[PDB]
Short mmCIF file of all heavy atoms in Angstrom, two decimals:
data_model
loop_
_atom_site.label_atom_id
_atom_site.label_comp_id
_atom_site.label_asym_id
_atom_site.label_seq_id
_atom_site.Cartn_x
_atom_site.Cartn_y
_atom_site.Cartn_z
N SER A 1 12.40 128.90 88.76
CA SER A 1 12.99 127.60 88.90
C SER A 1 13.96 127.24 87.83
O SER A 1 15.06 126.72 88.04
CB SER A 1 11.91 126.50 88.97
OG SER A 1 12.58 125.25 89.00
N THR A 2 13.60 127.55 86.57
CA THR A 2 14.50 127.24 85.46
C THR A 2 15.74 128.10 85.42
O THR A 2 16.85 127.57 85.13
CB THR A 2 13.75 127.38 84.12
OG1 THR A 2 14.57 126.97 83.05
CG2 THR A 2 13.35 128.86 83.94
N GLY A 3 15.66 129.40 85.78
CA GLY A 3 16.84 130.25 85.74
C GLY A 3 17.87 129.78 86.75
O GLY A 3 19.05 129.74 86.44
N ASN A 4 17.40 129.45 87.96
CA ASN A 4 18.30 128.97 88.99
C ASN A 4 18.64 127.49 88.77
O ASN A 4 17.77 126.62 88.72
CB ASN A 4 17.67 129.18 90.40
CG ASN A 4 18.71 129.28 91.46
OD1 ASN A 4 19.61 128.44 91.56
ND2 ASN A 4 18.63 130.36 92.23
N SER A 5 19.93 127.23 88.57
CA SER A 5 20.36 125.84 88.35
C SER A 5 20.08 124.92 89.48
O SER A 5 19.81 123.73 89.29
CB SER A 5 21.86 125.86 88.00
OG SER A 5 22.14 126.47 86.81
N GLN A 6 20.05 125.42 90.71
CA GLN A 6 19.68 124.58 91.83
C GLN A 6 18.20 124.22 91.79
O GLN A 6 17.35 124.97 91.27
CB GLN A 6 19.94 125.33 93.17
CG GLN A 6 21.37 125.70 93.43
CD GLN A 6 21.52 126.44 94.78
OE1 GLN A 6 20.57 126.60 95.51
NE2 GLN A 6 22.76 126.83 95.04
N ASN A 7 17.87 123.04 92.31
CA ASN A 7 16.52 122.60 92.33
C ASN A 7 15.71 123.45 93.34
O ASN A 7 16.10 123.54 94.51
CB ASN A 7 16.46 121.10 92.73
CG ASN A 7 15.05 120.49 92.62
OD1 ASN A 7 14.12 121.20 92.35
ND2 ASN A 7 14.98 119.20 92.83
N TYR A 8 14.60 124.00 92.89
CA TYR A 8 13.75 124.83 93.68
C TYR A 8 12.31 124.37 93.72
O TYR A 8 11.42 125.09 94.20
CB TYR A 8 13.76 126.31 93.21
CG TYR A 8 15.00 127.08 93.58
CD1 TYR A 8 16.09 126.43 94.17
CD2 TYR A 8 15.08 128.43 93.32
CE1 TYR A 8 17.21 127.14 94.55
CE2 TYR A 8 16.19 129.15 93.71
CZ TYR A 8 17.27 128.50 94.30
OH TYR A 8 18.38 129.22 94.68
N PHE A 9 12.07 123.15 93.24
CA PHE A 9 10.74 122.55 93.30
C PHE A 9 10.34 122.29 94.76
O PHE A 9 9.18 122.46 95.11
CB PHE A 9 10.74 121.28 92.48
CG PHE A 9 10.91 121.58 90.99
CD1 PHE A 9 11.41 120.66 90.10
CD2 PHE A 9 10.65 122.88 90.51
CE1 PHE A 9 11.53 120.93 88.77
CE2 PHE A 9 10.79 123.16 89.18
CZ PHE A 9 11.21 122.20 88.29
N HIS A 10 11.32 121.87 95.57
CA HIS A 10 11.00 121.66 96.98
C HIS A 10 10.61 122.95 97.71
O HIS A 10 10.08 122.87 98.81
CB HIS A 10 12.14 120.99 97.68
CG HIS A 10 13.41 121.83 97.72
ND1 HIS A 10 13.69 122.75 98.68
CD2 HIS A 10 14.46 121.82 96.83
CE1 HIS A 10 14.84 123.33 98.41
NE2 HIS A 10 15.35 122.80 97.31
N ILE A 11 10.88 124.12 97.11
CA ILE A 11 10.47 125.35 97.75
C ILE A 11 9.08 125.82 97.20
O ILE A 11 8.34 126.44 97.96
CB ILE A 11 11.53 126.42 97.47
CG1 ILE A 11 12.86 126.04 98.04
CG2 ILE A 11 11.10 127.79 98.03
CD1 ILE A 11 13.94 127.14 97.96
N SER A 12 8.77 125.51 95.95
CA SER A 12 7.51 125.96 95.41
C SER A 12 6.26 125.33 96.09
O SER A 12 5.30 126.08 96.33
CB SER A 12 7.47 125.63 93.90
OG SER A 12 6.99 124.31 93.66
N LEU A 13 6.29 124.07 96.43
CA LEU A 13 5.09 123.49 96.97
C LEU A 13 4.67 124.06 98.33
O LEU A 13 3.50 124.39 98.57
CB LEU A 13 5.28 121.95 97.15
CG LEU A 13 5.19 121.03 95.93
CD1 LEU A 13 6.39 121.15 95.01
CD2 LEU A 13 5.08 119.57 96.46
N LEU A 14 5.64 124.27 99.21
CA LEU A 14 5.32 124.77 100.58
C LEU A 14 4.79 126.21 100.49
O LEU A 14 3.88 126.59 101.23
CB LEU A 14 6.52 124.60 101.48
CG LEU A 14 7.91 125.26 101.23
CD1 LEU A 14 7.81 126.66 101.64
CD2 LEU A 14 8.98 124.58 102.02
N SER A 15 5.38 127.02 99.60
CA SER A 15 4.94 128.39 99.38
C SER A 15 3.48 128.35 98.89
O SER A 15 2.65 129.20 99.33
CB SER A 15 5.88 129.05 98.39
OG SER A 15 5.77 128.40 97.19
N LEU A 16 3.19 127.48 97.98
CA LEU A 16 1.80 127.26 97.61
C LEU A 16 1.01 126.73 98.78
O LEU A 16 -0.16 127.15 98.95
CB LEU A 16 1.73 126.28 96.40
CG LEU A 16 0.50 125.93 95.59
CD1 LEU A 16 0.91 125.60 94.21
CD2 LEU A 16 -0.17 124.71 96.24
N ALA A 17 1.59 125.87 99.59
CA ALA A 17 0.95 125.45 100.82
C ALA A 17 0.75 126.64 101.75
O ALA A 17 -0.26 126.79 102.41
CB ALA A 17 1.80 124.35 101.53
N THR A 18 1.80 127.54 101.81
CA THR A 18 1.63 128.76 102.58
C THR A 18 0.51 129.59 102.05
O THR A 18 -0.26 130.14 102.85
CB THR A 18 2.96 129.57 102.54
OG1 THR A 18 4.02 128.77 103.19
CG2 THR A 18 2.81 130.90 103.17
N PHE A 19 0.39 129.74 100.74
CA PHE A 19 -0.71 130.51 100.14
C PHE A 19 -2.01 129.87 100.52
O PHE A 19 -3.00 130.60 100.79
CB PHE A 19 -0.55 130.60 98.64
CG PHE A 19 -1.82 130.91 97.91
CD1 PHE A 19 -2.38 132.17 98.05
CD2 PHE A 19 -2.45 129.94 97.17
CE1 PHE A 19 -3.59 132.45 97.41
CE2 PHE A 19 -3.66 130.24 96.53
CZ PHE A 19 -4.20 131.50 96.64
N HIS A 20 -2.11 128.55 100.49
CA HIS A 20 -3.29 127.82 100.88
C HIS A 20 -3.69 128.12 102.35
O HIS A 20 -4.87 128.31 102.65
CB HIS A 20 -3.07 126.33 100.69
CG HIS A 20 -3.34 125.84 99.32
ND1 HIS A 20 -4.64 125.67 98.82
CD2 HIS A 20 -2.51 125.46 98.35
CE1 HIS A 20 -4.57 125.17 97.60
NE2 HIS A 20 -3.28 125.08 97.30
N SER A 21 -2.69 128.17 103.22
CA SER A 21 -2.96 128.47 104.62
C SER A 21 -3.41 129.94 104.83
O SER A 21 -4.11 130.24 105.80
CB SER A 21 -1.73 128.23 105.48
OG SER A 21 -0.52 128.73 104.82
N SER A 22 -2.99 130.85 103.90
CA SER A 22 -3.39 132.24 104.00
C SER A 22 -4.92 132.41 103.81
O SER A 22 -5.48 133.37 104.37
CB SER A 22 -2.63 133.08 103.04
OG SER A 22 -2.68 132.51 101.73
N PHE A 23 -5.53 131.60 102.99
CA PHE A 23 -6.94 131.71 102.74
C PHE A 23 -7.78 130.78 103.62
O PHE A 23 -8.93 130.52 103.35
CB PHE A 23 -7.25 131.41 101.24
CG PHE A 23 -6.97 132.58 100.36
CD1 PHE A 23 -6.26 133.70 100.84
CD2 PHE A 23 -7.35 132.59 99.06
CE1 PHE A 23 -6.00 134.76 100.00
CE2 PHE A 23 -7.10 133.63 98.20
CZ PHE A 23 -6.42 134.74 98.72
N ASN A 24 -7.17 130.27 104.71
CA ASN A 24 -7.78 129.40 105.70
C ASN A 24 -8.27 128.09 105.13
O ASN A 24 -9.16 127.47 105.69
CB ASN A 24 -8.93 130.11 106.38
CG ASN A 24 -8.52 131.31 107.16
OD1 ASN A 24 -8.86 132.47 106.74
ND2 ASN A 24 -7.71 131.17 108.19
N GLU A 25 -7.70 127.67 104.00
CA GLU A 25 -7.99 126.35 103.44
C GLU A 25 -7.53 125.22 104.33
O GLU A 25 -8.20 124.22 104.52
CB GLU A 25 -7.40 126.25 102.03
CG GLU A 25 -8.14 127.13 101.07
CD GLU A 25 -7.60 127.04 99.66
OE1 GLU A 25 -6.58 126.40 99.45
OE2 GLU A 25 -8.18 127.72 98.82
N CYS A 26 -6.33 125.36 104.92
CA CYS A 26 -5.80 124.46 105.96
C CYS A 26 -5.59 123.03 105.45
O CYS A 26 -4.48 122.58 105.27
CB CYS A 26 -6.78 124.42 107.13
SG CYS A 26 -6.86 125.92 108.09
N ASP A 27 -6.68 122.29 105.24
CA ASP A 27 -6.63 120.91 104.78
C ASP A 27 -5.97 120.76 103.42
O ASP A 27 -5.16 119.86 103.20
CB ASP A 27 -8.03 120.29 104.80
CG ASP A 27 -9.03 121.10 104.07
OD1 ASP A 27 -8.75 121.54 102.90
OD2 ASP A 27 -10.09 121.38 104.63
N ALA A 28 -6.35 121.67 102.50
CA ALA A 28 -5.73 121.58 101.17
C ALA A 28 -4.23 121.86 101.21
O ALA A 28 -3.43 121.28 100.45
CB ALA A 28 -6.40 122.59 100.24
N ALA A 29 -3.76 122.73 102.13
CA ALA A 29 -2.35 122.97 102.33
C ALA A 29 -1.60 121.72 102.81
O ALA A 29 -0.42 121.48 102.42
CB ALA A 29 -2.12 124.12 103.29
N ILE A 30 -2.26 120.89 103.64
CA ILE A 30 -1.60 119.70 104.20
C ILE A 30 -1.18 118.77 103.10
O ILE A 30 -0.03 118.26 103.07
CB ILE A 30 -2.58 119.05 105.20
CG1 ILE A 30 -2.78 119.94 106.40
CG2 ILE A 30 -1.95 117.71 105.69
CD1 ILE A 30 -1.59 120.23 107.26
N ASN A 31 -2.07 118.50 102.15
CA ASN A 31 -1.73 117.56 101.05
C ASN A 31 -0.62 118.14 100.23
O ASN A 31 0.29 117.42 99.81
CB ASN A 31 -2.99 117.25 100.23
CG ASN A 31 -4.07 116.55 101.03
OD1 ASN A 31 -4.48 117.02 102.08
ND2 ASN A 31 -4.53 115.41 100.51
#
């Protein structure tokens, strides 16, 4: 995120949400 001057915070959360969905957490990914 820091190296890239463009804002990439909006990409980090969903990917973490994606990771959450990979372990069948489901509800934790929603928040």
Side-chain angles (χ1 to χ4, degrees):
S1 175
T2 187
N4 205 310
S5 295
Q6 300 178 3
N7 187 356
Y8 283 7
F9 293 156
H10 62 87
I11 301 187
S12 86
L13 282 72
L14 61 78
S15 64
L16 187 151
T18 295
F19 159 69
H20 272 286
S21 46
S22 50
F23 280 13
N24 299 113
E25 289 179 359
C26 294
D27 51 48
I30 295 293
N31 298 53

